[PDB]
């Protein structure tokens, strides 16, 4: 059966009979640099964008848990805020995947 070299992140699937959700990039990771006017005027909207980002990936692992899939395949990188809700939801995660892994 299918052998994936990529390191298993989070706990194991809830069932071995799980529905396999294969996604190109559901989870992200944030870093930025100087803008059109360099280094934007506040850090409050940086905190305001960071709060909805966690509740976004909270609901992403939740809606996969609601729809029946107990494993998510991430061709993009793993978010930290996505990760600690995925452990409680008992859904297995792949940290990263290449072009051949998804196809």
């Amino acid at each position: 059966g299918m052998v994936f070299k990529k390191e298993t992140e989070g706990d194991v699937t809830s069932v071995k009979d799980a529905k396999i959700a294969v996604y190109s990039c559901p989870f992200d990771g944030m870093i930025t640099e100087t803008k059109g006017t360099v280094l934007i005027k506040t850090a409050e909207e940086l905190m305001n964008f960071s709060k909805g980002e966690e509740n976004l990936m909270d609901a992403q692992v939740k809606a996969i848990a609601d729809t029946g899939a107990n494993v998510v395949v991430t061709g993009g990188k793993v978010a930290d805020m996505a990760l600690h809700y995925a452990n409680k939801y008992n859904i297995m995660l792949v940290r990263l995947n290449s072009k051949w892994d998804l196809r």
Partner: protein, 52 residues
């Protein structure tokens, strides 16, 4: 990521907005002041002085 240059970008833009507010209030100051001197010079109290 730097939050002090986030304060530095906000600081220089607050320098710009203040100086422009001074200039528009100086021109309104001279506009009223030179409006005082012209109307006094022509025709003081003879019968009545209408004011808008």
């Amino acid at each position: 990521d730097q939050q002090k240059i986030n304060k530095f970008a906000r600081n220089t833009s607050r320098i710009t907005e203040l100086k422009e507010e001074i200039e528009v209030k100086k021109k309104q100051l001279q506009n009223l002041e030179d409006a005082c001197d012209d109307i006094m010079l022509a025709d003081d109290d003879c019968l009545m002085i209408p004011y808008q």
